[PDB]
Design a protein around this nucleic acid. Structure first.
Lengths: 432, 70, 51
RNA sequence: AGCUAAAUAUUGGCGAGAGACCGAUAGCGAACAAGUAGAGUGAUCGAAAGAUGAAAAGAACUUUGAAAAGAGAGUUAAAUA
RNA sequence: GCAGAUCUUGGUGGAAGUAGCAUUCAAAUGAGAACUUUGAAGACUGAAGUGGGGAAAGGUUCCAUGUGAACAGCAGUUGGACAUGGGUUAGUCGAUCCUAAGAGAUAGGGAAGCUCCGUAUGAAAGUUGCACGAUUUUUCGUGCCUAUCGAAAGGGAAUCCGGUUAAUAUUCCGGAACCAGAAGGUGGAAUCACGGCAACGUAAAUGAAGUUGGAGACGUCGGCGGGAGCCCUGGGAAGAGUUCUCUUUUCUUUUUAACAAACCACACCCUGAAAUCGGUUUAUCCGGAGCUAGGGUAUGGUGUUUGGAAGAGUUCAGCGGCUGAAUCCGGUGCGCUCUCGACGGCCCUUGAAAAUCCAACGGAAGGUUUUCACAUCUGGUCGUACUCCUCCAAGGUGCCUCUAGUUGAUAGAACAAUGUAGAUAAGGGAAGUCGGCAAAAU
RNA sequence: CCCACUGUCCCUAUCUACUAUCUA
RNA sequence: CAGAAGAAUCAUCGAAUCUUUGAACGCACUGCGCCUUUGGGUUCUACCAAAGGCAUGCCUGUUUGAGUGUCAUU
């Protein structure tokens, strides 16, 4: 036969570099990245980088050639090219002083549907439910950010609608399980169709954009997740029988009704069912309304927090009055005054908590993260030497690859953390 | 064909899965030749005393299809 | 050995452990090193005189 | 600067009907086998060769002979087919 | 309307049965044997074969079976004929790949035109030329470098042995290797490894862009050295001779492949400073640009010991496939053949190209690398029969002989004249003929 | 020109093979 | 001849198949490639196979560009 040329097969033929993937697809980096966001594509490092790089050694990212060949026949790529054509016709229309033809061009702007992207990425609904948490984390993060010249106002409006619809489903289906409070925000943990969903909702505050993050990347992730959430919410509402999408009360939204604007008209889940909580004007209503209604508790809130309040301040039906302010001039009776951590501690532990310990002005019991599981020996907040050394310095003496070395991190880090938090109880007892 | 002069490595290469067949040769010089067939190479071992030769017969694994003179 | 058979040899078996080893002779390497140092000194000497 | 049916031509192409034509050395080179067999490095050159009987009923069988065939025989209106 | 045209085509005569075209014996087969087959004898080519192979060319001529219609300057039981079947097996052999002189499409330009000139030419001459980037006003910016054909004799990754067919073998069978590429895995190694004054060594010991170096890759002749095979020959062994006697004698044979392991000698380094010149070639060459001498280093042409491997092959003995043995120790030479090394000339025109492989400088980058070891897998397409400018080539003294191959070329019988060729001849000796033309003389 | 030599010649004779001849 | 029993070496003919070539078109004249997709096997980063593709000139359009070509732009 013929002499096989070196490096014509194997890793050199299976893996493709980023630049060679660019020239193969005839794409630019911004468009190649954008299609890689929408599809499921990512770098893959081979075992032998030098062999896969045709004998070179420069640090170069690798992709599967089969992954790139799958992008050769992507209908979205032709939509990127159609947008380039439209953008140039819009430029010519305005540059020639034809305003009306520019408006017509803007109306027929080429848009693409992510139907087949979702199908080919997530074949089954449970697959989507697995990697749905990252989408929910971002849509809630961007539902509270101000509008920019990078991210539009329509995108922000869609993020609020999709987030509110999902919250309405969880409240309606009582699928919420745990709600945890942290400095980052509020960690929610729910279960849908058996799969576990965990996301984070930040506190509404007038933050500032860090100006170091690239919002072009945020644009494509937002576009992908919004399409993903829309189809997920459509199925979930069909499963419950609710017509999708739920209607939007314009007047209620204009009055900042929050979740109350969207009415879901039909086409230990009862921890707080026999309770009527009240919300003062110092508490995260966007979080307390979600958890309490999800577990059955009826909710009334201060008028300045949003219209559509079923309860008033003077209504005696109030069972508990959540108020984080250290002073309440017009104290009521039969509406025992507690702190917000009381509710979320009750959610985490699945039991009613000590209202006396969580009363206004009292000390605050430590917050327990339900996501943290009890370790082997980690502290939960709520003649031999010769044989030992011989059995401990023989693998580092005789064993071939010394894979026993992993103990130097597995046991070391766990022991150090265990020693610290075990001695912490000794220090706190001594202080007491 | 590597001539092998270490009995112990002849034993370990026999236990290794690459070994397929083994032959024992008795020449006129009262020497015993152990020929082991491997994937690519035929490893031979020449021993001169019968008692060590017999001891290495029973030291060879039973799975190996040893054969006598050809 | 043959040009094709040279590939099978190890890296240390084809090159001598020295600067320019395997491409320039040791005597040539010594002469090249000496000539470069002297030429550098002449450039340094000429620059000082010109300065 | 431009287009345009009919009357007109037609050794080719798809078919047809005829003739004071030739009748196998004739008529096409070729009635069969034909641009074939054959010749030449090649361009090219280029034949000869139609007829058993109505029906194959193409001669069973015997004998001589190594055989090819012969002689009796047989088929046919006739093997002077 | 044919007697003619050196008429055309066909058929057929005399000439005319005319001109003519190194074997022998016995046996077998056959209807039939001067021509077939076997055995014996006698001869012929005589290593430059009538030998054994290939290229080109032919196309089945190769093999087996059948026939004796057409071929057979004769015949056949016979042919290279006819009929029917069989026969060419490759990862390692060739092609395939590369280039040579040249050819040649493309760019352009001619030409009424069939077409011609033109081959990096005033071509926007890049198969995904290459790299960089948290994505760049989600409309791509920055930097770098800038045809094809033509060689079955040139260049080039890799296989040997034994056995096997009616016909095929580096191909098939048995055994034993090798090359290329591919990934992981296991063990080992470094955190971009050490040692030696040095030449350099080792199981490893990253190297981007960019920049070089080497192999490929290079005339011819002569002598010397080395090795292999062949030839010669001393024994040892075996068999077959010859043998009244002599002849420890005559003849014949006496194997180790690819590949894989360990070890085994001119260029350079270190000490050294030399002429009173030393070393030294078959051939006087070198030496303060550092001799002789001492110690090293590398290159291993080779050789040693094995493995392969005796289980194979060959030769003798037997037994009924099996069992025995041996297959040994030398010596060698201006020997022949082939190859390698070290020189010395002559060059002149100072002695192809490319594919391909390796190395150096360089310092981009950072569990990583790892040019160390081991296992695992695959190797497509085409030629392969046979016949024949070139290959292989014994001994002795132009002859003779061995190995090998034929005994065929239409045969028989008679030997007058004729013709050719070859001889001898008394006496004379060129008297022959235009003539010492040819012979003998020397 | 001399010497030697010989079938060139006086003067031809003999032998051998082949040819020539006949037979299939 | 044998053998078979809407037959047929039938006619007609509007549907199909149509090997290698040839204007002959991936490149060559036994071969050598590239691109897209699919498939296989003791068996998968390897190998193999299959299908559909890749000539030149020109025309209409499309997209992407180049120009120290002609300009506009507070």
């Amino acid at each position: 036969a013929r002499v096989k040329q070196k490096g014509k097969a194997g890793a050199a033929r299976i893996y493709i570099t980023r630049n060679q993937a660019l020239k193969k697809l005839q794409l630019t980096l911004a468009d190649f990245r954008r299609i890689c966001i929408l599809k499921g594509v990512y770098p893959r490092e081979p075992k032998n980088k030098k062999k896969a790089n045709k004998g070179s050694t420069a640090p170069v990212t690798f992709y599967y050639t089969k992954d790139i060949q799958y992008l050769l026949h992507e209908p979205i790529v032709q939509k990127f090219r159609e947008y380039k054509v439209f953008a140039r016709k819009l430029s010519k229309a305005l540059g020639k002083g034809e305003l009306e033809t520019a408006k017509r061009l803007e109306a027929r702007k080429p848009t693409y549907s992510l139907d087949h992207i979702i199908k080919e990425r997530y074949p089954t609904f449970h697959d989507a439910l697995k990697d749905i948490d990252d989408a929910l984390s971002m849509l809630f993060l961007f539902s509270t950010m101000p509008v920019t010249d990078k991210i539009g106002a329509a995108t922000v409006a869609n993020c609020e609608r999709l987030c509110a619809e999902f919250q309405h489903y969880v409240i309606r289906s009582n699928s919420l399980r745990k709600a945890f409070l942290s400095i980052k925000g509020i960690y929610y943990q729910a279960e849908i169709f058996g799969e576990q969903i965990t996301w984070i909702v930040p506190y509404k505050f007038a933050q500032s954009v860090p100006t170091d993050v690239d919002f072009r990347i945020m644009h494509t992730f937002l576009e992908f997740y919004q399409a993903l959430m829309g189809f997920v919410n459509f199925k979930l509402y069909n499963t419950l029988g609710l017509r999708y999408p739920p209607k939007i009360d314009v007047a209620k939204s204009e009055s900042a009704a929050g979740l109350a604007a969207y009415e879901l008209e039909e086409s230990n889940t009862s921890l707080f069912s026999n309770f009527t909580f009240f919300l003062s004007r110092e508490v995260p209503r966007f979080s307390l309304e979600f958890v309490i209604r999800a577990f059955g508790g009826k909710v009334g809130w201060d008028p300045i927090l949003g219209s559509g309040s079923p309860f008033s301040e003077s209504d005696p039906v109030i069972t508990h009055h959540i108020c984080d302010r250290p002073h309440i001039s017009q104290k009521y009776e039969g509406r025992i005054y507690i702190q917000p951590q009381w509710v979320y501690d009750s959610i985490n532990k699945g039991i009613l908590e000590r209202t006396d310990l969580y009363a206004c002005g009292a000390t605050l019991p430590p917050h327990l993260s339900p996501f943290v599981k009890v370790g082997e020996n980690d502290y939960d907040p709520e003649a031999e030497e010769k044989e030992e050394k011989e059995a401990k310095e023989l693998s580092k003496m005789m064993m071939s690859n010394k894979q026993r070395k992993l103990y130097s991190k597995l046991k070391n880090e766990n022991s150090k953390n265990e020693n610290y938090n075990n001695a912490l109880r000794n220090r706190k007892r001594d202080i007491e | 064909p590597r001539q092998i002069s270490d009995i112990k490595q002849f034993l370990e290469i026999a236990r290794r899965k690459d070994a397929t067949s083994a032959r024992i040769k008795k020449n006129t010089n009262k020497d015993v030749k152990f020929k082991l067939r491997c994937s690519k190479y035929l490893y031979t071992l020449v021993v001169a005393d019968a008692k060590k030769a017999e001891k290495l017969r029973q030291s060879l694994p039973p799975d190996l299809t040893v054969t006598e003179v050809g | 050995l043959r040009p094709r058979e040279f590939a099978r040899l190890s890296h240390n078996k084809k090159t001598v452990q020295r600067a320019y080893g395997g491409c320039l002779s040791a005597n040539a390497v010594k002469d090249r090193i000496v000539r470069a140092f002297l030429i550098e000194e002449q450039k340094i000497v000429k620059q000082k005189l010109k300065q």
